[PDB]
Design a binder for this molecule. Structure first.
Ligand SMILES: [Cl-]
Ligand SMILES: [Cl-]
Ligand SMILES: [Cl-]
Ligand SMILES: [Cl-]
Ligand SMILES: [Cl-]
Ligand code: NA
Length: 129
């Protein structure tokens, strides 16, 4: 599913992401925009052989099992394919674990490079929330 901007914001808000660990909703929408272009089915392979999955491009080296990343962990305890669903619940729950692990949203390279230090509230402007 390809989300609309305000549609995704409302879904993220409903799943408890707004101000989660101090990150306002705009940060999460900005990260999803530049990680996946709001597409739940996005996948991208990394040089180390791991793969990033879903709207927040969660990585198979640490967070999910895709059966082809040798010596990887499965810290969100889920198949990576579950992260590609039109229902974002699994992606959201796993993201909460990631952002809590010490490094905050810096774990998402696109957030660090394209959202951090910008007017992220602009991403939810005009939305009915
Ligand atoms: Cl915001
Ligand atoms: Cl393969
Ligand atoms: Cl694996
Ligand atoms: Cl959803
Ligand atoms: Cl933080
Ligand atoms: Na894994």
């Amino acid at each position: 599913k390809v989300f609309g901007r305000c549609e995704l914001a409302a879904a993220m808000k409903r799943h408890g992401l707004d101000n989660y660990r101090g990150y306002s909703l705009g940060n999460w929408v900005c990260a999803a925009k530049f990680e996946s272009n709001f597409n739940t089915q996005a996948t991208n392979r990394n040089t180390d052989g791991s793969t990033d999955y879903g709207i927040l491009q969660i990585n198979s080296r640490w967070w999910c099992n895709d059966g082809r990343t040798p010596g990887s962990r499965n810290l969100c305890n889920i198949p990576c394919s579950a992260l590609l669903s039109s229902d974002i619940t699994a992606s959201v729950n796993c993201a909460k674990k990631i952002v809590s692990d010490g490094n905050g949203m810096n774990a998402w390279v696109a957030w660090r490079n394209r959202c951090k230090g910008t007017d992220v509230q602009a991403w939810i402007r005009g939305c009915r929330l």
